[PDB]
Every structure is written in structure tokens, then in C-alpha cells.
């Protein structure tokens, strides 16, 4: 569709991984996710735009006796960060038509948030929620979300 400005948001989700005694993959809680800065503030990012798209950047690191998140993350232990409808009605994925908002902000802090996104770690073997993406929004028709 058409826009006057189209901010594209790059979200980086560095997920850390360990594996259990029986070779079961385990996504470390506090794999890190980072949002773009904005004002005397980074924690939350409101989108000051009439249109925006989101781009997830995943990075996996393995771990052993430590949390020394040094190593490749090969064999099942691999990972691709996936963002999932947590507690809010919208999916953040393609369901044909477009999301519409008068406001939309992603918070690393559960303060005044409307809902959650369950950031998880997809693997061949299973998928596991690691952190939460809090999202403050308002139903409207000013801002428009596109895929992805």
C-alpha cells in the first residue's frame, strides 16, 4: 500500500542454548533481545510513522557447564528466534489483510503494556518461549503494519 513514511524496525534476538543430560535442547532464559534506541530512552520504541514493517534478526550461541555463550549452535542445538502472539489478539504474521493501529510500541519492560509476545526458539525438535515482548497499542487506522 501507500505511505508518507515507512519506518522499518530491526529487532535483534540473541538466543542462548544449552542441552540437558539426555541431549534435550534448552533455550536459556535471558537470551537477549534489543530494540532500537529512541529519545533519552531505550527500553521501548513507539513507531512515529504511518507505516512500518518488522525484521527479526536471530543469533544463537551454545553453552556448557557455564553460561559462556561461546560456541556455534549446531546439531539440534541450533536456533532461529521466532516472535509469537503472546497475549495480544494480533499475530505479527501474515493473516491476509493488514494490522491497523493509532499507536504501537514495543517494550522490554512489562510496564503499562497491553500484551505480550512470546519470543521463542524454534528448532527441528521443539520450540521454547524465552523472553517476553511487551507491546503498548491503541486500536485505530493511522499506523499500518506490513510483513515480513
Amino acid at each position: 500500500p501507500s505511505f508518507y513514511t515507512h519506518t522499518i524496525v530491526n529487532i535483534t534476538i540473541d538466543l542462548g542454548m544449552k542441552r540437558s543430560g539426555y541431549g534435550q535442547p534448552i533455550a536459556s532464559t535471558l537470551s537477549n533481545i534489543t530494540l532500537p534506541m529512541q529519545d533519552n530512552n531505550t527500553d521501548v520504541y513507539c513507531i512515529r510513522s504511518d507505516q512500518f514493517s518488522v525484521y527479526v534478526h536471530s543469533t544463537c550461541k551454545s553453552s556448557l557447564w557455564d553460561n559462556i555463550f561461546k560456541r556455534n549452535c549446531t546439531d539440534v542445538l541450533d536456533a532461529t528466534a521466532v516472535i509469537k502472539t503472546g497475549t495480544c489478539p494480533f499475530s505479527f504474521d501474515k493473516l491476509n489483510n493488514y494490522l491497523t493501529f493509532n499507536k504501537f510500541c514495543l517494550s522490554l519492560s512489562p510496564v503499562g503494556a497491553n500484551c505480550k509476545f512470546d519470543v521463542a526458539a524454534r528448532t527441528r525438535t521443539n520450540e521454547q518461549v524465552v523472553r517476553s515482548l511487551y507491546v503498548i497499542y491503541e486500536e485505530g487506522d493511522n499506523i499500518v503494519l506490513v510483513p515480513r
Partner: antibody, heavy 122, light 108 residues
């Protein structure tokens, strides 16, 4: 009424191969992990690897890769373990044991088989 | 390859005694440790789960304690059927390791 019946004692020459049987009953054979553990006569327990019959997801300890092959006939309720190129140090008693449901990472092994004695001798 | 250590290797006990078995991991494993018993000629069996969790069917005298790197297996009043080998198992870090085991003898 969970039980695991293992195959009889094997007596095998070095360089040959063996395949141990383990028929389960009393629970759903496809929904629980089946682990295999090696016990040496004087020593402790050595985890060999598990297999989830639901598909045939197969894990292995580094020590046992290439030596142990695990299979599971779903409709037979029997789980197998194949060992290749047997040697003196392969001689031991091997247990097959039950684990948790699919996505259980930390389970304790629930029920064990009577064990299978495997002697390698020339 | 986290190494479990059980102490002592052998423990002399008499019926009715209180007893404690020990298992120390190289590194923290939380409560992801299990205890197994194995009578002579027998097959292992889970006594205590996640070192404190009790298992259905196990007699009240068995109990588990610990979190982190130190763990203990307790037998309140020893019975004759308690003569066996006891193995701790670490299930936290790959791969899952067992201890050398602690063996119970009868004292006379």
C-alpha cells in the same frame, strides 16, 4: 503395569555384532523415551542413548556414537539396540529403561529391564 | 563432562541405624539429580527424584536433600532389604552422568 522384557544373554566373538531386544508393555510404548544404559561388572552406570519411538528420534553419548544403533518397531512394542565390532571392553550387562514424555529434558528413568548380559570372547 | 563423586565408596550399617549417602557434582546442577538403588543381581530403581521429590511406592524412610553441588540421600531407619548399591545421577548438563556408587554392607 509397566514391565520391560529384555532378550537373553549373548555370547559373541570379537569383531562380530549383536542386537539386543526390549519388549515393553503396560504403558504407551510410543509416547515415552526409551533409554539404554551400560553397566560394567565392577563399575557404575554408563548412559548409552535414548530413542523416542513416536518417530525414531535418536540421541547418543559421544562415547557410543558409531557403536550403538537404536531402533524401535512401533507396532511390535519392542525396542532394539545394535552394537558393532564388539571387543573385550564391550562385555557387560545392558539395561533398557523408560523415560519421560517427549519434551521432558530432565526425567529420571522410570522402569528398567532385567538386563542383558553380553560377553565378548574369543 | 561433569563428574559426580559419591562418598564414601563403602558404608557399614546396622539395621535401624540412621544413614546418609553423599553425592557431589563438579558444578551446579540445581535439583536435576536422581537417586537409584540396585540390589545384587538386580536392576536399578529410582528412590528419590529431583533430589527431594518422593516417589510413589518408595517407603517413608527414604528422603532427599540438596540443591546446587552438594546432595544427600537419607535412610531414616535402615532395613535389611536396604543392602544394595546406591547411584546418584546428574541430568542437568549433557551428557547425563552417574556416580561411582555407594555400597551398603552389614556390620557385625
Amino acid at each position: 503395569q509397566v514391565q520391560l522384557q529384555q532378550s537373553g544373554p549373548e555370547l559373541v566373538k570379537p569383531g562380530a555384532s549383536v542386537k539386543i531386544s526390549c519388549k515393553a508393555s503396560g504403558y504407551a510404548f510410543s509416547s515415552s523415551w526409551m533409554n539404554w544404559v551400560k553397566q560394567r561388572p565392577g563399575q557404575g552406570l554408563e548412559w548409552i542413548g535414548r530413542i523416542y519411538p513416536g518417530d525414531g528420534e535418536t540421541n547418543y553419548s559421544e562415547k557410543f556414537k558409531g557403536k550403538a544403533t537404536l531402533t524401535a518397531d512401533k507396532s511390535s512394542s519392542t525396542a532394539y539396540m545394535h552394537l558393532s565390532s564388539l571387543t573385550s571392553v564391550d562385555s557387560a550387562v545392558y539395561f533398557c529403561a523408560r523415560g519421560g514424555y517427549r519434551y521432558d529434558p530432565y526425567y529420571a528413568m522410570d522402569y528398567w529391564g532385567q538386563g542383558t548380559s553380553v560377553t565378548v570372547s574369543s | 563432562d561433569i563428574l559426580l563423586t559419591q562418598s564414601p565408596a563403602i558404608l557399614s550399617v546396622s539395621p535401624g541405624e540412621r544413614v546418609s549417602l553423599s553425592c557431589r557434582a563438579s558444578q551446579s546442577i540445581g535439583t536435576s539429580i536422581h537417586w537409584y538403588q540396585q540390589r545384587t543381581n538386580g536392576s536399578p530403581r529410582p528412590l528419590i527424584k529431583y533430589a527431594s521429590e518422593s516417589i510413589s511406592g518408595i517407603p517413608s524412610r527414604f528422603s532427599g536433600s540438596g540443591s546446587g553441588t552438594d546432595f544427600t540421600l537419607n535412610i531414616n531407619s535402615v532395613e535389611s532389604e536396604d543392602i544394595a548399591d546406591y547411584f546418584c545421577q546428574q541430568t542437568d548438563s549433557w551428557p547425563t552422568t552417574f556416580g561411582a556408587g555407594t555400597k551398603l554392607e552389614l556390620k557385625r
